[PDB]
């Protein structure tokens, strides 16, 4: 399990600082079809389904995050009403999404790994996100900030100067 951890961790690692570099060099908002950035969620999804106990999947925990950092009150009702959004990991999925979109989720992780009381209700207690591999990761998200993402209309596809 502790190998699990690291392995995963070192996925991230990569992801992470593959996402950065790339969308530095690109220059221009992303979206879904990105390539390096839906690495990045598919990892991040990998690394928070990690020692979950045996079914909200991942969703469990994410749900914590608007009790600790209210501002992701507004994100984490938009999933709860986004259309057609059945299933928690679909739920989970989004959420992920529009905090990035946000530039918040370094903060959101940040802040549940930081509450491992709560969090053990929903992990192993040698859960990536229960372990240290779990608070390297929420710090390198931090550089995630500088990534513009856009997963709805975007207003440069539609304007024209009179």
Same mark, same amino acid.
């Given at each position: 399990?502790? $190998?699990?951890?690291?392995?995963?961790? @070192?996925?991230?690692?990569?992801?992470? #600082?593959?996402?950065? =570099?790339?969308?530095? $060099?690109?220059?221009? %908002?992303?979206?879904?079809?990105?390539?390096?950035?839906?690495?990045?969620?598919?990892?991040? =999804?990998?690394?928070?389904?990690?020692?979950? #106990?045996?079914?909200?999947?991942?969703?469990?925990?994410?749900?914590?995050?608007?009790?600790?950092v209210p501002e992701?009150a507004?994100? %984490?009702?938009?999933?709860?009403?986004?259309?057609?959004? #059945? %299933?928690?990991?679909?739920?989970?999925?989004?959420?992920?999404?529009?905090?990035?979109?946000?530039?918040?989720? &370094?903060?959101?992780?940040?802040?549940?790994? *930081?509450?491992?009381?709560?969090? &053990?209700?929903?992990?192993?207690? $040698?859960?990536?996100?229960? =372990? =240290?591999?779990?608070?390297?990761?929420?710090?390198?998200?931090?550089?995630? *900030?500088?990534?513009?993402? @856009?997963?709805?209309?975007?207003?440069?596809?539609?304007?024209?100067?009179?």
């Amino acid at each position: 399990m502790a $190998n699990e951890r690291m392995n995963l961790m @070192n996925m991230a690692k990569l992801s992470i #600082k593959g996402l950065i =570099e790339s969308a530095l $060099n690109l220059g221009r %908002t992303l979206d879904s079809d990105y390539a390096p950035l839906q690495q990045f969620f598919v990892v991040m =999804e990998h690394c928070l389904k990690h020692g979950l #106990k045996a079914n909200k999947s991942f969703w469990g925990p994410l749900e914590l995050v608007e009790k600790l950092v209210p501002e992701a009150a507004e994100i %984490t009702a938009s999933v709860k009403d986004l259309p057609g959004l #059945k %299933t928690p990991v679909g739920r989970g999925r989004a959420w992920l999404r529009l905090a990035l979109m946000q530039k918040k989720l &370094s903060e959101y992780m940040k802040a549940l790994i *930081n509450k491992k009381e709560l969090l &053990s209700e929903f992990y192993e207690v $040698n859960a990536l996100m229960m =372990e =240290e591999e779990g608070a390297i990761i929420a710090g390198l998200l931090v550089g995630l *900030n500088v990534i513009d993402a @856009n997963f709805c209309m975007k207003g440069e596809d539609l304007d024209s100067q009179v």
